[PDB]
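Q: What would this complex look like in 3D?
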Amino acid sequence: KCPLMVKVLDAVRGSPAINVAVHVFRKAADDTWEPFASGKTSESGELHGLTTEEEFVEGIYKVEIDTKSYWKALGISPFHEHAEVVFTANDSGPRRYTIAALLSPYSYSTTAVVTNP
Amino acid sequence: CPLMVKVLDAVRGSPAINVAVHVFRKAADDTWEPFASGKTSESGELHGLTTEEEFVEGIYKVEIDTKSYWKALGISPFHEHAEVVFTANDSGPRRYTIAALLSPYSYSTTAVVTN
Amino acid sequence: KCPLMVKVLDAVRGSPAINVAVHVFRKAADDTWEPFASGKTSESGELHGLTTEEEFVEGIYKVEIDTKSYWKALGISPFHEHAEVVFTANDSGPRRYTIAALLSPYSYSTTAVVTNP
Amino acid sequence: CPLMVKVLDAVRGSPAINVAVHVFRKAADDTWEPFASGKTSESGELHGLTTEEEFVEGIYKVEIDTKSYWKALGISPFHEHAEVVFTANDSGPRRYTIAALLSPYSYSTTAVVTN
Ligand SMILES: C[C@]12CC[C@@H]3c4ccc(O)cc4CC[C@H]3[C@@H]1C[C@@H](Br)[C@@H]2O
Ligand SMILES: C[C@]12CC[C@@H]3c4ccc(O)cc4CC[C@H]3[C@@H]1C[C@@H](Br)[C@@H]2O
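A: Here is my prediction, written as structure tokens for the whole assembly.
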């Protein structure tokens, strides 16, 4: 909801990827990754409510999507540990970010849709 | 040499082997005329479809028969085939590689155009 | 709306692809492509209302997305004429189909999300 | 031979040339230890990163420095880099090709694992 949303789809089943764990980190002043927010995708493959416009300040963020556990639960041993998405946010003022990922066992893609509010 | 097709399997992390590929050229009456065809190799590649002489400017379609590939693997697919439609242009680079990455409910295709 | 929706995104701009022409065809009994529906994507990159559950019977359908005109209007000469999506629909009863496409000048992807109503 | 990286540019339909690539291996203290690196060739490829001897089972990360690539082209990009994280497994095929297809606001990566 509002400034950061994550959407995950399954390219094998043509479906939302449900119950996928997502961890967001923010680079701290000492160049370490600090925990920022986390959650799981819903029945629609979406994860809303990770942060607020106030909390989501300028910075470098990493969205980890735990794809390996997703595939393993479906009986599949996939190639990747997780899909990582690393980006600078809000450098030119607040924006609305949708981070999308499309998953296959040995491949994925990831796409950002960015809107000006 | 001027046209190659390369196909990968995103589920198995492998070349997509034995996939039928049909190339067509658009005729003056806007129908698709068979132009060349073959099956992908053990490396997922299909070479020797055409020649510099035959591959003149025009509109081409490459059909990759993905449904039969997934059916052989016992995996239910969405698409009948992947279609790639483009105009060949002499002003650009001399070689077209039409690549495709296949999943049961999604495909990605790219053109790598080089000299 | 209801059983067939098309969504188009621009991978260069990280935005919906707006005002993209979309033509849907259905294979007739004489194995020819008959016009079925058409429209343009909205400001959200979506195209709703192409058909109804009544009209969208079993068959083989082709969704043509006119990507070349889209890129040309942005000053770009792209590789493909259009993105084609060809599929059998409703073979096992009515379903809800979202046909998504992600566009770049020399590449695209397309993905179906299929739901049981 | 056991690890290759191949990078393509979806905007220009070309190999992505001169892209920095850094490989890391996960250490016992869960930090990332520099393992190998290089720049993609004129064919968008990076060979000779490691050896059969050195490429033991473990968790590896391949970072592809996409932001600097797009910046050089004058195109505003979204990601800092593309990351690819995986466990090397001796039970599987002997060669890993890590491929990536780049756009300014989207990337796709595949592992092609072969003998
Ligand atoms: C990058 C790629 C996967 C890797 C492919 C590949 C893999 C190994 C290799 O030796 C060559 C290629 C060329 C096509 C490449 C695909 C084009 C696009 Br459709 C796909 O994302
Ligand atoms: C995952 C996706 C980008 C995000 C798209 C998206 C974005 C926002 C949203 O609300 C829905 C979708 C569904 C299609 C999704 C695409 C399908 C495939 Br063609 C592409 O990789």
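A: To summarize the key features: Residues A 7, 9, 98, 100, 102, 109, 111, 113; C 7, 9, 100-102, 109-111 surround ESZ (ligand 2) (CB under 6 Å). Strands of chain B lie at 3-9, 14-15, 20-26, 32-39, 45-46, 58-64, 79-88, 95-103, 106-114.
Q: Very helpful, thank you.
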